[PDB]
Write a protein that binds this ligand. Structure first.
Ligand SMILES: CCCCCCCCOC[C@H](COP(=O)(O)OCCN)OP(=O)(O)CCCCCCC
Ligand SMILES: CCCCCCCCOC[C@H](COP(=O)(O)OCCN)OP(=O)(O)CCCCCCC
Ligand SMILES: [Ca+2]
Ligand SMILES: [Ca+2]
Lengths: 134, 134
């Protein structure tokens, strides 16, 4: 599904070229860059010792954070608000990143764990994490 | 979340009156009627011996079928297509209806069971069912 008025917001993209943007050019730009994330793992793919069991793509946390900021700064506020709430709040996805082994949490916003505890004595390993609420 | 361009498509509605419709007046009309379904059970509600464990409203199958036809017949085809695919294909919801106790299936379209088998000798009971694909 791709959100009408955009070419890149949703599963994959329906752009005819790498540089095409939709009607909502600010919101779509944020999704375009998101889709072009250097490190992603497709549905059912296995990477960094992890495996994405979702029916949608899951990306590195760096890309997901940049996406968050992009949307919050987008001039197309109505469509960005919709895409932002959907992605970060309603589809219950996760991102991966290299971090010290996690030990605990302090539900920095219930439902999800934003200030988890790590063991700083053990080398970093790829793990799954919750996103901030939009 | 409510789909921009509509007042009724999404959780609840953001209409100011019972008769207000959004920009996409044909798509929105279909959602308005859907929301006004005589028999629904709110998130976590218990009804007809069933209980809705979803975080969204689940309605009777009659309403969900009427909604399907409404969308397929809507003049606002782009927004109806999006709302149709999302609701019937991606959120994995269910509807309830009075039917003979179910016994089996014949995945009338994989992922979901459209031609289930019933025991016609036992009185009808409310049960949960899959929706058609849009
Ligand atoms: C009800 C369930 C439907 C959920 C849809 C899942 C979208 C997947 O988000 C990942 C992609 C990024 O992954 P791909 O597009 O697969 O990545 C490109 C890598 N080839 O993010 P985006 O930036 O395109 C996200 C937009 C969601 C907005 C909601 C409006 C419908
Ligand atoms: C990623 C997860 C998000 C899923 C959103 C769940 C929507 C609930 O559909 C039920 C209502 C009907 O229930 P209520 O609106 O709660 O019913 C009114 C009863 N007071 O249907 P509608 O006709 O309003 C459905 C539209 C979904 C379209 C997607 C675009 C965002
Ligand atoms: Ca995309
Ligand atoms: Ca609604």
């Amino acid at each position: 599904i791709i959100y009408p008025g955009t070419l890149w917001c949703g599963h994959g993209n329906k752009s005819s070229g790498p540089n095409e943007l939709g009607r909502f050019k600010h919101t779509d730009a944020c999704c375009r860059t998101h889709d072009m994330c250097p490190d992603v793992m497709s549905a059912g793919e296995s990477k960094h010792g992890l495996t994405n069991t979702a029916s949608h793509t899951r990306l590195s946390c760096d890309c997901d954070d940049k996406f968050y900021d992009c949307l919050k700064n987008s001039a197309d506020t109505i469509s960005s608000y919709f895409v932002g709430k959907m992605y970060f709040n309603l589809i219950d996805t996760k991102c991966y990143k290299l971090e010290h082994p996690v030990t605990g949490c302090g539900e920095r916003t219930e439902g999800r764990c934003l200030h988890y505890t790590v063991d700083k004595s053990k080398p970093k390993v790829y793990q799954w994490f919750d996103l901030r609420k939009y």
